[PDB]
Amino acid sequence: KVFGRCELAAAMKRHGLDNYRGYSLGNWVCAAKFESNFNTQATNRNTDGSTDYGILQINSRWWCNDGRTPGSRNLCNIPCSALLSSDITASVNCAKKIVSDGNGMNAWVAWRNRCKGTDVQAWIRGCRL
Ligand SMILES: [Cl-]
Ligand SMILES: [Cl-]
Ligand code: NA
């Protein structure tokens, strides 16, 4: 599924992400825009043989099992295919574990380079929430 901007903001808010560990809703929408262009089916392979999955590009070396990343943990205890569903619930639950692990949203490279320090509230302006 390819979400619209306000559609995703509302789904993320309903799943408990607004101000989760101090990160306002705009941060999460901005991160999804630049990681996946709001597409739940996005995948991208990395040099080390791991693959990133879904709306928040969650990585197979640490967080999900895809059966082809040898030395990998499966810390969210899900198959990586579950992160490509049009229901974002599995992605959100796993994102909450990642952002709590000490490094906050710096785990998402696009957030660090394209959202951090910017006016992220712009990403939810105009939306009925
Ligand atoms: Cl915000
Ligand atoms: Cl933090
Ligand atoms: Na894994």
Side-chain angles (χ1 to χ4, degrees):
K1 175 183 177 136
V2 179
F3 278 84
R5 173 174 70 85
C6 297
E7 187 186 14
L8 181 62
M12 286 180 158
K13 173 166 184 139
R14 183 177 71 103
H15 280 94
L17 275 186
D18 189 10
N19 289 125
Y20 191 85
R21 280 201 97 93
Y23 290 94
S24 64
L25 200 54
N27 283 282
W28 297 100
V29 170
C30 183
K33 173 66 179 191
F34 292 126
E35 291 286 349
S36 72
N37 205 21
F38 296 146
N39 182 1
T40 67
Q41 297 194 77
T43 60
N44 282 288
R45 194 93 190 255
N46 303 127
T47 44
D48 68 4
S50 66
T51 298
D52 299 339
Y53 293 85
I55 195 95
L56 289 167
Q57 288 293 272
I58 289 175
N59 182 265
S60 72
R61 170 172 317 295
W62 303 103
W63 303 110
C64 64
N65 173 59
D66 66 1
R68 70 166 194 197
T69 312
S72 66
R73 337 269 55 182
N74 177 9
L75 293 185
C76 293
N77 288 320
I78 44 156
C80 301
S81 67
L83 302 175
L84 304 171
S85 167
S86 58
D87 178 347
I88 64 173
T89 294
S91 285
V92 167
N93 290 346
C94 186
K96 291 177 170 178
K97 296 200 187 177
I98 295 166
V99 75
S100 293
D101 85 355
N103 303 273
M105 288 198 70
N106 295 294
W108 286 280
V109 182
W111 179 87
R112 203 166 69 240
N113 288 325
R114 305 185 69 184
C115 305
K116 187 177 181 177
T118 77
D119 176 22
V120 290
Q121 189 141 219
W123 287 102
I124 56 173
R125 265 194 228 109
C127 308
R128 183 159 39 219
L129 312 168

